């Protein structure tokens, strides 16, 4: 049953505009600068020529809402043909891989050691502590991008259905994670612990907490190449369950 889990179970924070047998197109017109909410998810491999045509479509959509990047995911567990890779490189895209990790709840429950780490659901009361930790995270697209993602969370955190955690050690906020719950699964996203507080059991407390929420729901996540928590995931017991290629050009 945790066997059957796939990339389809992973949450996407866009509006789905179109979905057909080859691709799903996502946009978030009020937030055209969020790269993860504005993208094409392929279901079947485009030929090189198809891909060129799809560039043109996406280029128009995005410029129409003042989005300035381009991005695509390719099918689960499919390698891209040479000829298309070659084009991808020539058009100045970054190539990366998303990896799907899966684990059974009980395995995360087991991680608990009754450390003194106080873990709270975020509300208007502690939301700033959450963002405070967030502020420490790698910023691969620079400051102003991180800041506009901050503003988005800070104004959509009740409103949205996503739940969030902040861990404290001695009343200082130190760890965060987002959780997306469904009947079938629970997905974590945006997990991080401040550098100075790593490798000392704080992440595994957060994980076991999520584990206790899950019940017997599997818990799942997706990580890319610039994800430093991955090492932690493996040591923690997560099982690798497939990949997606994905490309990004930050400027049309």
Where do contacts with a second copy occur on this chain (CB under 8 A)? 79-82, 85, 89, 95, 97, 99, 196, 198-201, 225, 228, 230-231, 234-235, 240, 243, 245
Closest to a second copy by CB, 61 or 136: 136
Which one, 217 or 246, has the nearer CB to a second copy? 246
13 binds Na ion (CB under 5 A): no
160 binds, among a second copy, Na ion, none (CB under 5 to 8 A by kind): Na ion
How far is 117 from 130, CA to CA, in rounded Å? 15
Question: Could you give the angle at the alpha carbon of 34 between the alpha carbons of 146 and 196, nearest 5°?
Answer: 30
Torsion of CA 64, 66, 70, 76, to 10 degrees: -80
Judged by CB under 5 A, the stretch of 11-19, 133-141, 152-160, 228-236 that binds Na ion is: 152-160
Nearer to a second copy, 63 or 234 (CB): 234
């509300």: which residue's tokens? Answer: 123
Q: What burial letters (b/e) apply to 111-135, b meaning 16+ CB within 10 Å?
A: bbeeeebebeebeeebbebbbbbbe
Query: In whole angstroms, how close is the CB of 169 to a second copy at the nearest point?
Result: 10
CB 40, min distance to a second copy, A: 19
Q: Which does 212 bind (CB under 5 to 8 A by kind): a second copy, Na ion, none?
A: none
Q: Counting contacts by CB under 5 A, is residue 160 touching Na ion?
A: yes
With respect to Na ion, which residue has the nearer C-beta, 110 or 160? Answer: 160
Binding pattern for the stretch 26-55 against Na ion, x by CB under 5 A and - elsewhere: ------------------------------
CB 12 within 8 A of CB 41: yes
* Strand runs labelled E in the chain: 15-19, 23-27, 39-42, 70-73, 94-103, 118-121, 163-169, 172-181, 186-193, 219-223, 239-249
């Amino acid at each position: 049953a945790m066997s059957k889990i796939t990339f389809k179970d992973i949450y996407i924070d866009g509006n789905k505009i179109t979905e057909d047998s080859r691709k799903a197109i996502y946009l978030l017109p009020p937030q055209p600068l969020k790269y993860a909410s504005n993208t094409w998810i392929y279901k079947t491999m485009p030929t090189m020529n198809q891909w060129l045509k799809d560039i043109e479509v996406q280029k128009k959509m995005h410029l129409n809402q003042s989005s300035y990047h381009l991005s695509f995911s390719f099918p689960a567990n499919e390698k891209i043909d040479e000829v298309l890779l070659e084009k991808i490189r020539e058009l100045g895209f970054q190539i990366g891989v998303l990896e799907l990790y899966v684990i059974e709840a009980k395995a995360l429950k087991e991680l608990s050691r009754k450390r003194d780490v106080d873990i709270q659901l975020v509300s208007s009361n502690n939301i700033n502590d959450y963002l405070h930790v967030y502020d420490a995270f790698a910023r691969p697209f620079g400051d102003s991008y991180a800041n506009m993602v901050k503003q988005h969370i800070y104004s959509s955190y009740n409103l949205d259905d996503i739940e969030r955690l902040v861990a404290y050690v001695n009343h200082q906020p130190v760890g965060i994670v987002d959780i997306i719950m469904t009947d079938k699964t629970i997905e974590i996203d945006g997990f991080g612990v401040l550098e100075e507080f790593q490798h000392q059991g704080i992440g595994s407390e957060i994980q076991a907490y999520v584990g206790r929420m899950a019940n017997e729901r599997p818990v799942i996540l997706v990580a890319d190449g610039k994800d430093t928590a991955k090492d932690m995931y493996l040591r923690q017991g997560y099982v690798y369950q497939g990949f997606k290629y994905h490309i990004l050009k930050e400027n049309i």
